[PDB]
Amino acid sequence: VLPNPGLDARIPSLAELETIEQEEASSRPKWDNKAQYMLTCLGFCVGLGNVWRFPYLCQSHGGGAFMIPFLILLVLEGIPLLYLEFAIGQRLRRGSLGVWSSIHPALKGLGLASMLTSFMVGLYYNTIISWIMWYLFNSFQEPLPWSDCPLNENQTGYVDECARSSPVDYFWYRETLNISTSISDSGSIQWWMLLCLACAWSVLYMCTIRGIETTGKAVYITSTLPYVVLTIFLIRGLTLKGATNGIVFLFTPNVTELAQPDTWLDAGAQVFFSFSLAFGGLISFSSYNSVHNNCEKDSVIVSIINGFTSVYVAIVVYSVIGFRATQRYDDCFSTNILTLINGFDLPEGNVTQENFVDMQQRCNASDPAAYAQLVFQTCDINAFLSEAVEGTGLAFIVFTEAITKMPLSPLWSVLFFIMLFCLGLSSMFGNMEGVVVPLQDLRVIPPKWPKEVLTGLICLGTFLIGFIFTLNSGQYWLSLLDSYAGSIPLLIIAFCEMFSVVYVYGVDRFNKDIEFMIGHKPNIFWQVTWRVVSPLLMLIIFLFFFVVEVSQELTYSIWDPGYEEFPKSQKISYPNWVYVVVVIVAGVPSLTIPGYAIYKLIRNH
C-alpha cells in the first residue's frame, strides 16, 4: 500500500540510518554506556516528580484518594507516551525542535512551545532550590534556628508574631521570606536570598558547563543519593511513634473524595510532571544513542521504578505526618488533664489518659458551678491527621518541627535537605538540557560561539529575570505562576504530539521502523492505547479542566500580623490586573500555523 502521504525524501531516510550506523560519525555527543543514560533519565524523572509537587498533592487531597487515580492514569497514559517519545527519538536523530520540524515542517510550533514551557518551569524552579540551600546553611548547629523564638527588646517575653504563631512559621514567613502584608507591595532585594540564588545558579552552571559530557558524570552521585538516604528515613520514620498510624491512614481510601472529580484534574497533570513528558528533555536524551537499543524495556523499567519511588515517598511523608499528629494529640490531652488537676487540686498521678471522663463526671457532680469556670478543649485523632498545609509548608513547616522533636535533629535536618537539594538539582539538569539545545538547533548562532559562552549567557539571563522572586512579594508571585504554569500547556503539547504521530507520519510506518530498528513489534495493547484510549482520555480531562477553569475561585493565603484571628488563613481574592499576566501563557502554541499557512498561500504567487 505504501502509506506515505508525500513526506519522504526529506526526513533522514532509513538508508541514511544504515549509512550513519556503520561508520560512527563524530561531532555528536554519545553516552559512555547505557547505564549513564538510564541513570540520567531516572534522575530527571524522579527530580521533576518527587519535589514540591507529588508529596504536596498527596497530602493536600487526603492521600490514598489521590494515589489510586494517579496510579491508574499513569499505567494507562504515561507508558504509551513515554514509549512514543523514546522511539520518535533515536530514529530522526535530532532534538525536540529538530524532530518535530523534520516531519510536516509547516508548524514547528510545539517545539518552541516546549522550549517556552521548560524555560518557565526552570524560572520558577531553582528558587525552590535556593530556599532549600538557605535552610541547609542554617543547619550544622545544635540549637536549630526554627526551634526557638527570638527575644523582644523588652528582654522579658517573646515577640507577638512569634508568640501567636509557632517558631517555625516565624522563621519561615519572617526571618527567611520577610513576607509582606500586601501583594503589590514590594521591598528590598533581601540580600540573603540574592546570595543563595546566585550560589544555586553558579553551582548549576558549573555542573553543566560543557553539557552532556559533564552531566553524565554529575548525575552519577546526584541521581543516586536520594535513594540511599530516603530508605534510611523509613527505618527511622516507622518505629518511633507512628508505626501503622499514619501509614494505616494512607492505606484506607476515601470514597467521598473520589466522588469529587477535582482530584482527577490534578492527577493527570502529575503524571506529566512524574514522567517528565511534554518537555524537550528525554528526546535529546533519546536521540543520542545507537540504533540498536530496546526502547520498550527502557520504558517499562523506568515506569516501574517511578511507581515504586512514588509509593516510597508517600509512605515516608505520611509516616512523618502521623507521628506529628500523635504528638500534638498527646500534648493536648496532657494539657486538658493538667487543667482539670489544677482546677480541683486532685493528686497528680490519679488521673490518666483512660480514666479522664469518669473523673471529670465525678468532679462536676461533686462541686457544680465551679467546674464551669474551666475552658476545656477537644482533641481527637483524625482531626489533626486531616489537617492539610498549603503552599510549600510540607517540609519547611511540618518536617522541620517533626525533625526538631526528634533526638539528633541537626543530622537528619542536614541529610534531608541534602536529599532535597539533590532531587532539585537532577530536575534542573533535566529541564536545562531542554534549553539551549533548541537554541543551537534553530541555527542562527554565529559559527564559532563555543557552547560554554551560550550556556553562561542563558544562565545569566535567567538569573536576571528570576531576580524578581528575591523581593518581599516573591512567594505570592511564585504561587501565582505555579497556579497556571503546567497543566494546560503540557496538555496541549501532549495533544499535539499524539495528533502529529497518529495522523502525520503514521502508525503503520512507525511499526515498520521499530520492527526494522530492533524488532519486537508492539502488541495490541500499545496500538489500542495510541489509537483511541490515551488521546481520548487526555482530551476529556483537558476539556474538564477547561470547563472547571470558570468555577474554582481565585485567592491565596496571606501573612498579615495586623489582623484579628492572626494564626488563621485569610483570603482577599486577586487584583484586577494580575489576570493580564496569565494571558502570556494563553495561546502560545497555535500562533505559527496560520502564519505559515498565510506565507505559503501568498508567497508562491
Binding site: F137, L151, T156, L195, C199, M206, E452
Partner: protein
C-alpha cells in the same frame, strides 16, 4: 515549683556569635568558584 505570681524572666541565650550560615555559604562559594575555574581551564586546554 511555681509560686503563682512570680514567673522567671532572665533566660537570654547568645549561642551563635558569628552566623555560621555566612561562613558555610562562603566556603561553598569558594569551592564553587575553584571548581568553575579548573573546569574552564581544562575546557580551554583543548589544544
Amino acid at each position: 515549683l511555681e509560686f503563682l505570681g512570680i514567673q522567671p524572666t532572665l533566660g537570654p541565650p547568645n549561642q551563635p556569635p558569628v552566623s555560621i550560615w555566612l561562613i558555610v555559604f562562603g566556603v561553598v562559594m569558594g569551592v564553587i568558584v575553584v571548581g568553575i575555574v579548573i573546569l574552564i581551564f581544562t575546557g580551554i586546554r583543548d589544544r
